[PDB]
Amino acid sequence: RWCVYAYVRIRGVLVRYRRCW
């Protein structure tokens, strides 16, 4: 019951996104 963001390597770049349990 929590959510957190993370960064992924896409297009040789670092993109941030939001995640949830």
Swiss-Prot record:
Disulphide-bonded residues: C3-C20
Function, as annotated: Has antimicrobial activity against the Gram-negative bacteria E.coli and P.mirabilis, the Gram-positive bacterium L.monocytogenes and the yeast C.albicans.
Name of the protein described by the UniProt record: Arenicin-2
Species annotation: Arenicola marina
Taxon lineage: Eukaryota, Metazoa, Spiralia, Lophotrochozoa, Annelida
Part of the intact protein present: 182 to 202 of 202
